[model samples]
Target: YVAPTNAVESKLAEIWERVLGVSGIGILDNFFQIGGHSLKAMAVAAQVHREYQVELPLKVLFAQPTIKALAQYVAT
Candidate 1:
């Protein structure tokens, strides 16, 4: 696991850390592997969507499920 390289990864990692009730989350960290419940995606989704001001499908979230994949997908 590595630290975030940019704003997208930074904020997303922060949100994941908060939602999962964890700390020092990294870019490569897997959400479920860390401590995420499946249903908790709703909370995390609610966050990043509002934080970044964009709408995304939850399917893509679970499909990739990593900060690295997500930041790239979102930043793109």
Candidate 2:
């Protein structure tokens, strides 16, 4: 798990915290390992699309599974 290194990662951490019902979500934390599943991932993607205006695919979360990777994909 990669530590959050910027604002994007930080914001993702916050989003993950709310979506996964957990706290202290580091950028390196795995989404599924932290209790996130498919339904949660869909909710998260919807919320994130609303928040960041980035239409992230549901599969993206499964592929990335970490704030750092997701943020990087969004940053792209």
Candidate 3:
């Protein structure tokens, strides 16, 4: 997995690392493929809401499903 390059990417990577209890998250890594489940997705969304003041629904994570896609979604 590649190191995160920007703040959003780094932050998402950090959140996933903590929620998933693993490290070395690639930007394009699939959340489910990386062991993320519904509860973890909810945890990620909640943490992202706290960190970025963005309300991300579980569906967004379902649709995005990767750090790169999710970063873009959260930013927009």
Candidate 4:
């Protein structure tokens, strides 16, 4: 199960909005259907690298492709 602090969740939501180019985002939203391609995935990963110093893999992005999921991954 995925669990992240409220702060992490809130910030990740904003990141998702920026990365996915959406006005809003939710925990349950799927990434790809919202136009998340490999390039966007890389960009998000790069941004996360800058923010958290974690080298997030594209495979992980595909597997847990949501702000909620990524937040939990970072927390854990």
Candidate 5:
């Protein structure tokens, strides 16, 4: 199983778990592949906004769709 490899990924994993109600979230997990969808993505984005105060558009989230991808975006 893929595991979080960085601090941002770790935190994002927590958010994903809380939002998605799934445990042991991996860095490469596709947001939609693991029982995610538009509304849940919005909630995840909302939490990201609260955490980083950055605007993570749903478009980007859809495009990224993984903690590994989005963590870098958030990291950057």
Candidate 6:
């Protein structure tokens, strides 16, 4: 498994909490299980854009929900 940095990990947890509507989120938790969907993905993307200035496609976000992968995807 890929080890995520603190910044990426923190962002990942934040996104999951916002999307899942929970106070705590697990690293291995599937994003969809927490009530995530296309619209939520858009919201996540919007947040990412606002926070990181990365305009990501929804498909990418859904495919890679973990902040580690998301950060990499956005950075790329």
Best by lDDT: 5
User: Candidate 1 has which clashing residue pairs, if any?
Assistant: none
Q: TM-scores across all candidates?
A: 0.81, 0.79, 0.85, 0.76, 0.85, 0.67
Which consecutive 10 residues in model 6 have the weakest lDDT in total?
Answer: 1-10
Model 1: CA > 4 A from native? none
Clash counts per candidate, in order, are 0, 2, 0, 0, 0, 0
* Poorly placed runs, candidate 3 (over 4 Å): none
How many clashes would you count in candidate 6?
Answer: 0
lDDT of 2 by residue, 1-76 (tens): 3457877777777787887887777776677865734676566666667768886887887788677887776765
- Per-residue alpha-carbon lDDT of candidate 6 for residues 1-76, written as tens digits (9 for 90 to 100): 2344555556766876786676666554555655735676567666677778776778777778655567666655
User: Per-residue lDDT tens digits of candidate 3, residues 1-76?
Assistant: 6576566877788887788776877886777875735788567777779888886888888888777777777766
TM-score of 5: 0.85
The parts of candidate 4 lying over 4 Å away from their true place are 1-5
Candidate with better lDDT, 2 vs 6: 2
lDDT of 5 by residue, 1-76 (tens): 4677787777788888888888877787788876745787667777788888877899989888788887767877
lDDT of 5: 0.78
Q: How well is each residue in 1-76 modelled by candidate 1, as lDDT tens digits?
A: 4568888888778777788787877786677875646655556666677876766568877776777777766776
| lDDT rank order | 5, 3, 2, 1, 4, 6
lDDT of 3: 0.76
Report the Cα RMSD per candidate: 1.8, 2.4, 1.5, 3.7, 1.6, 3.4
Tens-digit per-residue lDDT, 1-76, candidate 4: 2433465556666777687787567774567756735687556666667778775788887788777777666655
What is candidate 4's CA lDDT for residue 65? 76
> Best by TM-score, which number?
5
**Model 1 Cα shift for residue 14 (angstroms):** 0.8
* lDDT of model 3 at position 62: 85
lDDT of 5 at 72: 69
| Model 1 root-mean-square deviation | 1.8
